[PDB]
């Protein structure tokens, strides 16, 4: 039918607290923007722990994708940064609720009173590092495939968000791809050497293999282990 796209039932507004949280994060870490990559990798790691746990009790947990990895790709031409994990993934309902809504009050006051020291650790602690992606990106896209649902896409420029069934079908198998449309002034993150340095620094203590799609010398491209 056409009733879905004709009723904008895929459009959502963020919860007030999430709006306030995004601002605090953006205003707090304005001087240390590179941490966004650390947070995405951390979230990726957590997603992997979750499916690994589920695989303990569910023999079919890994049916959609046998690997447990984090792969980072730079698309300079497209101005896109991709961080893909083969973790638990998220259902449509989870994309809407986990990303659009949120000890939040305390954290709110904590974050404010934290900007009168630092918020870098607090963000990781409360698990809202995802939103730091907006420090370097104008648009944040989340493509996710959960075992209990079909692949879906969540997109946002921070002023609202939408979730749609992925017309490409199940291409992830299981997992999540965080796609960042980098702000013009954040083009440096499209550089391999830069991403490699950061990835290696923030992946050092991740219990899962983390790869960066890189080139080697003709010139060939392939996954390069960073940790």
From Swiss-Prot:
Sugar-modified residues: 43, 148
Positions with a binding annotation for ATP: 43, 85, 98, 130
Record PTM Phosphoserine, positions in chain: 105
Residue ranges of the TM segments: none
Entry similarity comment: Belongs to the heat shock protein 90 family.
Function: ATP-dependent chaperone involved in the processing of proteins in the endoplasmic reticulum, regulating their transport. Together with MESD, acts as a modulator of the Wnt pathway by promoting the folding of LRP6, a coreceptor of the canonical Wnt pathway. When associated with CNPY3, required for proper folding of Toll-like receptors. Promotes folding and trafficking of TLR4 to the cell surface.
Protein's UniProt name: Endoplasmin
Gene: HSP90B1
Residues of the full protein shown: 69 to 337 of 804
